[PDB]
Every structure is written in C-alpha cells, then in structure tokens.
Amino acid sequence: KMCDPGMTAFEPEALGNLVEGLDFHRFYFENLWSSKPVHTTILNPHIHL
Amino acid sequence: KMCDPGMTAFEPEALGNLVEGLDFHRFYFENLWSSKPVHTTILNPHIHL
Structure with missing residues (x-):
C-alpha cells in the first residue's frame, strides 16, 4: 500500500x-522476514519538502 | 524440446x-534442480529479429 x-x-x-x-x-x-530479535536505529534523518 | x-x-x-x-x-x-524458494528477475531485455 x-x-x-x-x-x-x-x-x-x-x-x-x-x-x-x-x-x-x-x-x-x-523467505527471510517471515525471525530472530532485530533492532533498527535511524540516525540523522533529513527531510526535503 | x-x-x-x-x-x-x-x-x-x-x-x-x-x-x-x-x-x-x-x-x-x-542433481541440483530436482529445491528451495528461488525467484528470477529479467532486466533490460533486447531482441534482434
């Protein structure tokens, strides 16, 4: 979506x-994502409107 | 064929x-192909007649 x-x-x-x-x-x-503990981290996000 | x-x-x-x-x-x-999930992708096809 x-x-x-x-x-x-x-x-x-x-x-x-x-x-x-x-x-x-x-x-x-x-295949892969259907699964052990995983943590994501987003650093320095920049947005252009 | x-x-x-x-x-x-x-x-x-x-x-x-x-x-x-x-x-x-x-x-x-x-041997090999007789079988885990496999996905093929064709990119930039060119045909000469």
Whole structure:
C-alpha cells in the first residue's frame, strides 16, 4: 500500500541494477522476514519538502 | 524440446570451453534442480529479429 506499483529501486540486492516494481522485494518478504530479535536505529534523518 | 540437439553453449560451468549438446546441462537438471524458494528477475531485455 505504501509503495507505488511502478516503484523504482536501487539497492545492493540488485547488484548495481535498477529494479522496478515490488516483485523483487517479495522474495525477501516471503523467505527471510517471515525471525530472530532485530533492532533498527535511524540516525540523522533529513527531510526535503 | 526448446533446444537444438547440437546446441552450442558458453557458460562459467564450462570453464572457458565451448560445450555442444545437452549432456552437459543434464548434470545440473538431475542433481541440483530436482529445491528451495528461488525467484528470477529479467532486466533490460533486447531482441534482434
């Protein structure tokens, strides 16, 4: 819901390629994240309106 | 069916050699692929007619 159907993506899992859509991240939602303790921390956020 | 009987092949599994036929890929069809979740993604396809 929070992502556009034609979402553009640059990430190390794409190996320097540009990925379009949500099909690519689905593999990580299905396999890995479906789960040991994990803590995230956001540092120095900047927002441009 | 989709491959010619005298199919030519260059691939890293051939270690820089040119492989003819389908006997070479049979080892990978029999052993490895006969099976955990795997997702393929095709990027930037170009077709020459």
